[PDB]
Structure formats: structure tokens, C-alpha cells
Write a protein that binds this DNA or RNA. Structure first.
Ligand SMILES: [Zn+2]
Length: 58
DNA sequence: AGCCTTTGACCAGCG
DNA sequence: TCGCTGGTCAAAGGC
């Protein structure tokens, strides 16, 4: 999606099967992080973005 | 070296 | 207070 991310965890939530993976924008000081649930088919079923990139893309 | 993913255990916050 | 649940740490390993 055009940004750089570093994974920092994966948990298995309630009700929804697919596990959830947490990532953090790797830009210096950038605080955006996101959480991701993908289907068994590898399709994005849910993305939460928590912040906004005060920087340009790479 | 430096950066990433995996993994298991710890944090908090709310009911 | 307790303990489940989602969010995070950080070590151990891979690249
Ligand atoms: Zn960013």
C-alpha cells in the first residue's frame, strides 16, 4: 500500500477466525500503526489504521 | 551490522 | 479484586 511497516505481533481474536497482525510505520518518529485480518484466501477482510503519516511515502 | 518476522509472556482496561 | 481480551514487548532466529 506504498508504506514501510515492521510487524510487532499477531493474535487470534474472538469470533472471527483469521488471526490479526500488528504493524508499525518504520519512518522515524512516525506513530501510525495498523492491524490486519486476512482471509484463508489471503484477502484483506479488515484493516484498522490508527494514526496518520506526517511524512511522504517512499 | 542492521533490519525484519515469529513467538510467548506481560500490560491495561473494563465488566 | 479477578480475569478475560486485545494490544505490546523484546528475545531468539532468519535474512
Ligand atoms: Zn508513517
Amino acid at each position: 500500500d506504498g508504506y514501510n511497516w515492521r510487524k510487532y505481533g499477531q493474535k487470534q481474536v474472538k469470533g472471527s477466525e483469521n488471526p490479526r497482525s500488528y504493524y508499525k510505520c518504520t519512518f522515524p518518529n512516525c506513530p501510525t500503526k495498523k492491524k490486519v485480518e486476512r482471509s484463508l484466501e489471503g484477502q484483506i477482510t479488515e484493516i484498522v489504521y490508527k494514526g496518520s503519516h506526517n511524512h511522504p511515502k517512499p
